[PDB]
Amino acid sequence: TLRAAVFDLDGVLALPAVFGVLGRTEEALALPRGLLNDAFQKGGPEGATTRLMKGEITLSQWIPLMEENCRKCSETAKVCLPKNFSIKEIFDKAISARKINRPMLQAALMLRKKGFTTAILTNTWLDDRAERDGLAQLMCELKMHFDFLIESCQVGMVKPEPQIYKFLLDTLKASPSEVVFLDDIGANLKPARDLGMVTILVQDTDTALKELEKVTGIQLLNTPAPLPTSCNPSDMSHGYVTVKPRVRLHFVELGSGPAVCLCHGFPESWYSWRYQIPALAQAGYRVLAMDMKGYGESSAPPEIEEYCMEVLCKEMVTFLDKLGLSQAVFIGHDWGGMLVWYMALFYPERVRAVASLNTPFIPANPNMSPLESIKANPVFDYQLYFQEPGVAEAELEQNLSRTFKSLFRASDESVLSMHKVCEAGGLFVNSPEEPSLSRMVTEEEIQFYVQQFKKSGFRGPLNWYRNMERNWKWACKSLGRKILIPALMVTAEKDFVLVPQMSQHMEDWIPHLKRGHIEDCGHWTQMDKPTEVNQILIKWLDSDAR
Amino acid sequence: TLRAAVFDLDGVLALPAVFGVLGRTEEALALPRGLLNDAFQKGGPEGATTRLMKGEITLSQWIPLMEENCRKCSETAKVCLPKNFSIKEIFDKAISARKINRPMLQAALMLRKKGFTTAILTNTWLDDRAERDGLAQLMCELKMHFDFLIESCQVGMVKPEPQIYKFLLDTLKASPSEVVFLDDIGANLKPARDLGMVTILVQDTDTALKELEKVTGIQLLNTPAPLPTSCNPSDMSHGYVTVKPRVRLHFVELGSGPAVCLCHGFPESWYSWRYQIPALAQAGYRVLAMDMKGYGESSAPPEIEEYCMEVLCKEMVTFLDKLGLSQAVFIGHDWGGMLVWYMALFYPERVRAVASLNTPFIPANPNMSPLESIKANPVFDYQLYFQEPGVAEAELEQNLSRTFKSLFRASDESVLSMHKVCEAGGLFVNSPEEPSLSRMVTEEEIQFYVQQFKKSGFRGPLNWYRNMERNWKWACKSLGRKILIPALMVTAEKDFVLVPQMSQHMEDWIPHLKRGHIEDCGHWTQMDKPTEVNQILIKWLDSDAR
Ligand SMILES: O=C(Nc1ccc([N+](=O)[O-])cc1)N1CCS[C@@H](c2ccccc2)C1
Ligand SMILES: O=C(Nc1ccc([N+](=O)[O-])cc1)N1CCS[C@@H](c2ccccc2)C1
């Protein structure tokens, strides 16, 4: 019974095969057929290429040796190489053109999801070229999805030598009959077959995957669109900044490029951005996913006033100061969306661009108390329930698993009524003791929220709702301003608390506002429709946020 | 008696004054004298500029109002404004030209060092221009050196209104007679003087500083070159990455731009880079200053083999993987310098560029055991003392303060002999019990090292020396390679362990190697000559590392 799948890199996990460029070059330059591929393999086990693949020499030292072999071959073939012939240019272009074979990666991802151990086994080189970063980025993107990456230049062994296959089996801790090995080189497949491994010669991806699903008994072809890559909390870089004596802010950090600060809502976590963090970093951004004040590993002081928008925003500015960031693009959802509009209004010099999921920008009404404004909307009744210190804390803290399972539900999963919460006497009074698991979350993801909230509970989080008057007075100071930095408003069709129509007048205060809209999407935007959130954010980031 | 110094921004801490550009523009465009400065102040307390400075409107909303005022003024003066007249262009250029007044900043730094509370009090605006980052960067660089930054647009008050001065005194927690207030605007100085503050009208910096030193009794002019900005450990962003089940790596992170990974030596800390971290971040880099494996907040497993170069390097690659960095420039000192050359040799695709302080690159001799090679050099005797587990640990751990005070000494401060350490029976056998404090360190800096080493002691650190044979065998695999990525070798004249002459053959293996050399500099390069280390590293980074 199979339990391990091994993939080659060139011609299997990445296409077009860097190998196939020698053939393409011969054709484009009208050189004798196989001349370049012959110079490439010259000397066989004792030649320059084997030394390169074993890690004896680097790619830059190999380049002149390949050029000498090309000349020796051309002399024998009684031909002339072009005037401007460059092995470096040929390989720079070939490596740059080589991209991940997405259906092959999806298959390896599915096999690993079904309990297989997966590995990449590759004949590769030590790349010291000026443009080596492109390949580094490729290898980084691919390697994260596999249990092991075995590189010939690192192990000092090369396919087809039998030792590399015994090394593979030893790292896999598996007998050969338990292993599928996929390669585009028939000669490199032979030693695996000779040991009794199931082997697949890869020409076109589709046939290789039909052979692979026939042999594993797992559907890999024509399968539904998979979810974006999520985060394993223990595999992340965890950052901590003290913003004032009793307050520290925690964040998860991934990637390089312009800083993108992700601000979650109520009652959430940095982990609410789990499907966005890997995608935004892959898109060329440095992601800083916060635990907002009152949450997870960030400090949660008890005082109500520690949670007014003026102080929360001041602390986020201090957070940038301490990290040495002059700006960040700010992306918020829910209460984090409210903070992000206030960051744009009060600190435009620190905000590269601003985006909000669900939360619209609505200016303070100076002729009405915020209580009156909240009371006018029947959907906002739950906010009055949140006012009295200790009441919502007791109910939300009574059974953590029940709390998250009841809150975190898709629009079709009997959401939770938000009207007559005060009349009813609580949020979960008409809710089951043991709610069913929403399709948006796994049991393990729920238990991450339970564990996070065990530290500080709901006092700090509920305090974000307890500064209505304080926030209203501060917001009134900004009534003559306009938001003129790049801005994105993303609406969610089925969010019945933060309804798309509530955002209809935003243009009056943000004239150049850009929009996104997600249909069949409830309040929990990020986990409800992760693929579409990612597409809308990356498109806006690359156009408007550098 | 004075105890607080307050500085204006424009014309005082930053020059040329953005104000003075209206005059310059009038002259360059042959417009009536004061026409632009008159349109700028139009309406006085009720005009567009006051609304801007109070934060009622942003800089982008103000721009058309200033243009209307310019036209109204020109109509009255019976003149025409040019065809291509643009307030935006004028202000973009003026703000971009405005730089920190370094001697004024040095004076504020000296006053704060002598116990003064310092503040910036400024009439400024909410900057939402596309080029707002330049000013954001300026404000960031300046604000870090002060106790308070009071901005008119944030407090909704403006100089010369008396309320802003009462607000200043309340934030300073000081009576007016205790405050020096420096401003380039005579009208903005009057309310401070009226309250009884010592005031200084700033025209030329030199006269202002003579007035300032006369009044405080502190030398601020013609003073020696100050040290670069250091780090306060509690003010930094602290990062943590798990690289494998029992191993986590700690780092301090500051700035934005290409990732620069700082690797300390023995027996050191991330804090050994304290004078480099702020300077490199200011220079446009993202600094990651490590606690190397075995040190500070990083894990310190007991096994010798956990500290061989192959594993240390593999873990540093995993560290980049987990942070989502395809590359970093690697800068090492001492044992960190050795690791960084090995990162370049084994993982060139992950190393943007490589620099070493003191540690040369010397290839492994395959015809001699590493023990023999170490025994050949009399200065390397202390390494034989470090071999036997527990022996050097007991001596180095006996009195932590004595350990660091004995080790950390400048070339002229009776360093410590490194020959006949085994014969002598220890490192400190001819050393005093209570060593004097080196001029390189303060008592507080010593106590930071003491506190860090209290966690794991010297077992993990000494284990870096205990893998001679293991490192020699691994290094021999790289004997046919050359280092062809950008490389910097920095030599220290008076390092008598890592002598400059030991680096003389490096070109044979690193043909394009660049060099730096520091005269009158001992082993502790970073703290011995911080200004020169900073100059050499920033120059090489901007030329060779993007
Ligand atoms: O209550 C909110 N969202 C929310 C989040 C979670 C739940 N929940 O039930 O889990 C309910 C509501 N909001 C956060 C974004 S704006 C905020 C708001 C503040 C002032 C006025 C109107 C609306 C309301
Ligand atoms: O011992 C070293 N430095 C050092 C650091 C601190 C002290 N000290 O006394 O504090 C003494 C020596 N070295 C680290 C850089 S290369 C290393 C080395 C390894 C192998 C062969 C020769 C030299 C020696």
Side-chain angles (χ1 to χ4, degrees), chain A residues 55-58 60-61 125-128 130 132-133 135-137 140 143 153-154 234-242 251 253-256 286 317 321-327 345-353 477 480-482 484-486, chain B residues 55-58 60-61 125-128 130 132-133 135-137 140 143 153-154 234-242 251 253-256 286 317 321-327 345-353 477 480-482 484-486:
Chain A
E56 288 173 39
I57 56 160
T58 75
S60 297
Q61 300 178 281
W125 52 82
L126 297 170
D127 203 335
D128 56 350
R132 74 199 169 274
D133 190 48
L135 172 119
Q137 286 180 45
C140 279
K143 80 195 246 177
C153 56
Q154 280 291 305
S234 64
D235 290 331
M236 313 302 293
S237 186
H238 286 263
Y240 307 80
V241 177
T242 299
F251 64 101
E253 194 174 33
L254 188 75
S256 59
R286 170 190 178 179
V317 173
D321 291 341
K322 304 247 187 143
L323 261 163
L325 302 175
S326 60
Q327 286 184 334
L345 277 172
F346 287 78
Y347 301 102
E349 47 285 275
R350 304 295 221 120
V351 185
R352 215 291 97 207
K477 298 188 198 314
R481 307 178 197 157
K482 282 197 179 177
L484 297 168
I485 70 169
Chain B
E56 288 173 39
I57 56 160
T58 75
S60 297
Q61 300 178 281
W125 52 82
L126 297 170
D127 203 335
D128 56 350
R132 74 199 169 274
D133 190 48
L135 172 119
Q137 286 180 45
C140 279
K143 80 195 246 177
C153 56
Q154 280 291 305
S234 64
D235 290 331
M236 313 302 293
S237 186
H238 286 263
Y240 307 80
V241 177
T242 299
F251 64 101
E253 194 174 33
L254 188 75
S256 59
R286 170 190 178 179
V317 173
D321 291 341
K322 304 247 187 143
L323 261 163
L325 302 175
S326 60
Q327 286 184 334
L345 277 172
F346 287 78
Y347 301 102
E349 47 285 275
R350 304 295 221 120
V351 185
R352 215 291 97 207
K477 298 188 198 314
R481 307 178 197 157
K482 282 197 179 177
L484 297 168
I485 70 169

Side-chain angles (χ1 to χ4, degrees), chain A residues 267 400-408 446 449-450 453 458:
Chain A
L400 289 168
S401 186
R402 185 182 181 227
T403 290
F404 296 103
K405 281 179 186 181
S406 307
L407 291 176
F408 304 168
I446 290 294
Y449 286 84
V450 167
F453 279 80
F458 290 75

Side-chain angles (χ1 to χ4, degrees), chain A residues 60-80:
Chain A
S60 297
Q61 300 178 281
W62 172 93
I63 303 285
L65 316 170
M66 171 55 46
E67 293 187 296
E68 169 58 20
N69 286 339
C70 281
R71 170 251 153 183
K72 277 203 211 270
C73 281
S74 71
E75 190 184 81
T76 311
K78 281 188 195 163
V79 295
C80 291

Side-chain angles (χ1 to χ4, degrees), chain A residues 266-267 334-335 338 359 374 380 382-383 386 407 416 418 427 465 468 497-498 502 523-524:
Chain A
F266 175 92
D334 187 70
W335 264 111
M338 184 80 290
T359 313
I374 274 135
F380 296 149
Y382 68 94
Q383 298 198 32
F386 291 175
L407 291 176
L416 239 200
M418 234 76 96
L427 252 309
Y465 285 99
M468 275 149 61
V497 176
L498 308 174
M502 267 176 67
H523 182 70
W524 314 104

